[PDB]
Amino acid sequence: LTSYDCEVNAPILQGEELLRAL
Amino acid sequence: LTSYDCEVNAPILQGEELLRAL
Amino acid sequence: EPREEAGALGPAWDESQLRSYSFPTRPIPRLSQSDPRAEELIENEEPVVLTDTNLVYPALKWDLEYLQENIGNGDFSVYSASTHKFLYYDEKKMANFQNFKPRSNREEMKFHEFVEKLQDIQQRGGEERLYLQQTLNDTVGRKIVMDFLGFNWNWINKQQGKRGWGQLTSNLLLIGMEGNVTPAHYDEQQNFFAQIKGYKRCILFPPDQFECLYPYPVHHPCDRQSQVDFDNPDYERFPNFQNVVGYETVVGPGDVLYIPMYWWHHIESLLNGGITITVNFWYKGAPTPEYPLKAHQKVAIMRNIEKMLGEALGNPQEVGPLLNTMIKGRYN
Amino acid sequence: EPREEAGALGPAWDESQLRSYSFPTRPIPRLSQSDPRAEELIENEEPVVLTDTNLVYPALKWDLEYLQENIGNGDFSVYSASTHKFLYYDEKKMANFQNFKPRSNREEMKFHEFVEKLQDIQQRGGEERLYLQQTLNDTVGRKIVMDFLGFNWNWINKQQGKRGWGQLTSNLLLIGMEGNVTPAHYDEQQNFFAQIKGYKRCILFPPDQFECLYPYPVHHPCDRQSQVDFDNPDYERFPNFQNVVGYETVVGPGDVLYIPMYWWHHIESLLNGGITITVNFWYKGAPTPEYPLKAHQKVAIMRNIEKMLGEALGNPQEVGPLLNTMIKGRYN
Ligand SMILES: O=C(O)CCC(=O)C(=O)O
Numbered sequence: 001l002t003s004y005d006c007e008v009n010a011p012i013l014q015g016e017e018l019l020r021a022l
Numbered sequence: 023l024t025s026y027d028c029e030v031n032a033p034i035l036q037g038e039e040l041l042r043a044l
Numbered sequence: 045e046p047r048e049e050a051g052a053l054g055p056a057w058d059e060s061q062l063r064s065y066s067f068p069t070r071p072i073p074r075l076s077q078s079d080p081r082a083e084e085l086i087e088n089e090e091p092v093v094l095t096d097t098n099l100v101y102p103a104l105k106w107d108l109e110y111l112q113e114n115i116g117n118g119d120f121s122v123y124s125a126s127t128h129k130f131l132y133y134d135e136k137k138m139a140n141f142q143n144f145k146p147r148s149n150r151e152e153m154k155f156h157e158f159v160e161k162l163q164d165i166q167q168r169g170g171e172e173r174l175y176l177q178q179t180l181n182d183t184v185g186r187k188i189v190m191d192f193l194g195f196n197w198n199w200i201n202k203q204q205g206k207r208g209w210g211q212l213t214s215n216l217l218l219i220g221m222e223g224n225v226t227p228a229h230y231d232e233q234q235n236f237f238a239q240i241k242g243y244k245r246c247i248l249f250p251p252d253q254f255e256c257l258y259p260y261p262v263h264h265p266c267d268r269q270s271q272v273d274f275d276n277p278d279y280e281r282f283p284n285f286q287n288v289v290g291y292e293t294v295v296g297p298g299d300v301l302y303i304p305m306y307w308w309h310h311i312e313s314l315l316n317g318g319i320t321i322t323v324n325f326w327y328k329g330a331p332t333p334e335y336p337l338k339a340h341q342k343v344a345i346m347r348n349i350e351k352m353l354g355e356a357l358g359n360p361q362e363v364g365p366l367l368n369t370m371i372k373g374r375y376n
Numbered sequence: 377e378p379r380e381e382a383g384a385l386g387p388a389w390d391e392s393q394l395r396s397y398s399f400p401t402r403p404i405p406r407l408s409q410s411d412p413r414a415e416e417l418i419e420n421e422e423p424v425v426l427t428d429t430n431l432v433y434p435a436l437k438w439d440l441e442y443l444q445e446n447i448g449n450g451d452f453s454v455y456s457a458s459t460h461k462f463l464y465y466d467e468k469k470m471a472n473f474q475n476f477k478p479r480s481n482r483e484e485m486k487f488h489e490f491v492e493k494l495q496d497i498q499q500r501g502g503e504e505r506l507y508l509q510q511t512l513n514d515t516v517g518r519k520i521v522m523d524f525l526g527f528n529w530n531w532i533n534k535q536q537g538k539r540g541w542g543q544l545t546s547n548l549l550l551i552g553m554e555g556n557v558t559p560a561h562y563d564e565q566q567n568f569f570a571q572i573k574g575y576k577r578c579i580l581f582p583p584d585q586f587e588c589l590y591p592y593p594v595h596h597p598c599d600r601q602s603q604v605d606f607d608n609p610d611y612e613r614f615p616n617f618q619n620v621v622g623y624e625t626v627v628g629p630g631d632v633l634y635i636p637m638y639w640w641h642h643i644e645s646l647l648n649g650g651i652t653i654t655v656n657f658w659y660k661g662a663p664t665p666e667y668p669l670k671a672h673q674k675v676a677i678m679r680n681i682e683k684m685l686g687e688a689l690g691n692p693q694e695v696g697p698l699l700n701t702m703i704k705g706r707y708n
Pocket residue numbers: 031218225226231235237303309311312322324
């Protein structure tokens with residue numbers, strides 16, 4: 001009930017994936 | 023969420039158990 | 045219109061024996077158990093009075109003398125009150141609502157003690173009221189055992205089977221004084237309510253009248269009971285009580301009222317009608333399997349939300365404030 | 377009091393460049409990244425402006441010309457509006473609220489197209505406003521790739537590790553026109569907000585101000601955004617907005633604002649301050665493991681109840697009426 005999602009003011013490579021690829 | 027318990031205006035042999043024993 | 049007792053013994057009761065309330069009602073159908081319409085009503089979870097089941101035929105001879113003589117030496121729960129209203133309360137929930145002060149008290153006694161108590165009140169013209177409410181169990185005596193086995197199990201077992209109900213959890217014996225009232229509430233089990241002695245007026249409301257009946261919070265001791273005082277309705281706190289509409293009937297010896305699970309019911313022993321005796325048959329409902337959702341399914345949902353919130357917040361008193369914070373300026 | 381730009385270049389901005397609102401605020405602390413108090417604030421999920429992280433040091437030279445020349449030929453989401461307010465909305469939720477009419481529209485274009493559009497508005501004295509908001513991805517060019525790799529990963533990776541955060545989900549590039557506003561909302565991720573060009577006034581509210589900020593229903597497209605129009609607050613619908621108290625700061629090039637998960641934030645590009653550029657860093661929060669519950673945990677709870685009800689009732693529009701039916705005359 002205390003669990004949460006990860007929504008932000010933006011739609012769902014990027015982030016960690018972008019960085020490593022680079 | 024639609025699931026239900028079995029509470030009534032009485033506290034929790036009797037019922038089916040009483041009948042069979044008898 | 046009050047039925048006529050066989051052998052021209054006159055009306056079983058009259059209007060003056062009924063209490064007066066603010067809402068209208070329509071009659072619950074009284075039908076034969078062999079009548080297909082009765083089966084249709086039960087199947088659909090709608091109330092019906094069955095007049096000829098012979099469900100508790102052997103108990104029709106029961107009276108205080110016979111029961112005192114044969115019901116054994118087990119303990120019996122007897123509620124005592126100074127009002128005609130016997131509002132049910134769950135003792136286990138009392139710790140979480142320290143400010144709740146019950147208007148009735150429970151006492152455990154032997155049957156002969158209950159009878160003696162009833163006798164002393166009568167003789168001394170006391171205003172005290174008693175209501176015995178005790179699950180039938182293994183300590184009852186042989187004659188009661190014989191009577192119980194003579195109940196119409198064939199008929200009721202078929203009902204249980206036809207409706208997919210769960211097990212019989214219990215049979216509550218209710219012995220009340222004239223004028224006693226069990227205030228409106230709903231139970232989460234299916235109930236065949238078998239009248240034995242005297243007359244009881246039963247007023248039922250469908251589950252879709254939840255908004256008009258204002259049940260206490262789930263964690264309050266009076267969970268499942270209506271907060272509305274039917275004798276003095278507070279329309280400021282409970283405005284939709286002005287829209288409530290009941291289904292009513294008066295049951296007597298031999299009658300069986302099907303009180304469907306989640307249906308609200310208010311039950312009163314007729315004024316000046318003497319003591320009443322009833323035995324109910326409580327069965328767990330069928331399993332939860334389609335839209336649109338039924339009223340009773342929404343009730344189940346609301347109860348679950350209340351329960352989960354109570355557990356997650358760690359304090360049931362925090363349920364209200366969170367609920368309010370959720371809706372104000374957002375959903376209301 | 378507005379800081380002084382090095383080399384006696386005068387005040388970075390003045391009061392007249394800030395919009396006027398109905399509530400008071402206190403300043404967010406501006407501190408060095410080496411200052412233990414900064415670490416204490418982040419650890420405690422409280423906002424802080426860090427002045428010397430060098431988080432996006434290589435991006436400080438970014439401007440429209442450099443970006444147009446190097447950011448590649450990928451698509452960029454650009455919002456267009458006729459108001460200064462860029463209320464965020466979730467397109468996937470639009471089907472369930474047919475009556476919601478967005479005040480801003482999204483268009484996908486190439487970077488050079490965004491720039492050209494900005495140019496045409498300026499020249500024609502148009503009142504239209506644009507806001508580019510695009511996640512940085514694999515199509516950016518080599519120079520941008522070089523800049524991005526030059527971000528202070530050492531420092532931010534340690535933060536991620538120290539706080540037990542989940543993964544970096546993305547970096548949003550925001551390029552706005554002067555006067556643009558992103559209305560108050562909260563995000564469910566941790567955010568280091570790294571200012572690059574121009575100045576942005578950031579007003580934050582703690583999660584315990586939920587009752588004063590009136591977020592839309594969870595299933596509405598503006599889930600997580602405040603329903604209150606900060607420019608014309610309707611105190612009849614949102615009475616507790618009269619009790620709101622913010623934490624504010626103005627960030628400029630080189631500054632990084634920690635916007636803790638669940639903290640409300642209202643962000644505005646200073647009036648007459650030219651275009652702004654920001655790059656954020658969004659990280660999933662730590663895992664959910666003790667009473668008393670934190671404000672943000674209660675928020676999580678309320679969101680979940682709303683979500684479950686929406687799914688169980690099969691129609692999100694039924695959420696309100698059930699919630700109301702649950703509380704009136706019972707918890708309110
Ligand atoms: O007869 C009564 O007073 C109450 C019975 C009742 O509420 C029930 O059998 O469910």
